[PDB]
Assembly symmetry: C4
Homo-oligomer: 93 residues x 4
Amino acid sequence: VGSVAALLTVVFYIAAVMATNLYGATFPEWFGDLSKSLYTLFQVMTLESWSMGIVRPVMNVHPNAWVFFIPFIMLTTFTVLNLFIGIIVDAMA
Amino acid sequence: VGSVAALLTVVFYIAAVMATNLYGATFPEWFGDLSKSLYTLFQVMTLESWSMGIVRPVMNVHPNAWVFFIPFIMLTTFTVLNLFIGIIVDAM
Amino acid sequence: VGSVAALLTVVFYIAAVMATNLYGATFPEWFGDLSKSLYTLFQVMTLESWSMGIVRPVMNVHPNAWVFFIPFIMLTTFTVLNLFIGIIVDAMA
Amino acid sequence: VGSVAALLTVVFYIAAVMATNLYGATFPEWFGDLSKSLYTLFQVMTLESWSMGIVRPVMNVHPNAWVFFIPFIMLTTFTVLNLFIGIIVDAM
Ligand SMILES: [Br-]
Ligand SMILES: [Br-]
Ligand code: NA
Ligand code: NA
Ligand code: NA
Ligand code: NA
Ligand code: NA
């Protein structure tokens, strides 16, 4: 369980570093700095306006932005689910 | 588990082929080509603006568009859940 | 499992009948007829624009519309989850 | 199971008291009174327009509003899930 939580944090920071680099200059309110990026990627992970609100406006400038977000969503919005189930199963003793 | 992942892919491509045909000419930014369609159907599967953003504007032109999306959502947003649980159970 | 699916259908139709009556005259594009209502309540069950898109505009005219939707969300967005888990557990033999 | 449901209610009312205090004067339609706050925090817990609709407009006035909502979302959108699974397991 602790190994899963460590994997997600390392993945979250690297993704937020990557996103700052890629879309910070063109979408500064969303990826302008690591802090803005970590907040956006959490919102993207929770799926709130991920497409209409974020990815569609982003993809308009970066046609292939989906190569980052779609797998990023597939990984985190699976790992979080796996982690949360992991705590629940471990709780029974 | 591998059988489930294969079923979802085949279903996803056929649905995206179908949607391109049905709503590509009237909603090209959303279903204009297979690529645009696969991206939209993933967004529809995650449920982001599926109604207000997609299905409601679509249904305005195609009154019965719900006959495609509602079952499509019912299938994928069940199979993905079944697949993800399938990996978790198999891991132990 | 079959008993759960029957309970949800009966609940869905009665809720959609109730909603047509309550908010059909003031919000016809959303609850104007049983068909429009069943489509809206599914969208509300999936949680797409349930508040900003539906309940907030509705509550503006019917201040207590939350007494219908909040429990309706609590019931269906629990029963569907319980039904889907029910099929998964029953599949193993 | 009953202990979990009690923990969530106590957490929900305290969070809604806190939010009324913090953002009621600047965002009254959203946190103007405990009732408005409890309705908003449920909508935030379901994740409907939590960022674009609520937290982003809020953070514009309170730059650190994320210190409240992100953990609030992390707690409730875990406890509800844990509670719902708890009823399902106890049913057998
Ligand atoms: Br997914
Ligand atoms: Br809920
Ligand atoms: Na949304
Ligand atoms: Na969702
Ligand atoms: Na959502
Ligand atoms: Na959601
Ligand atoms: Na949404």
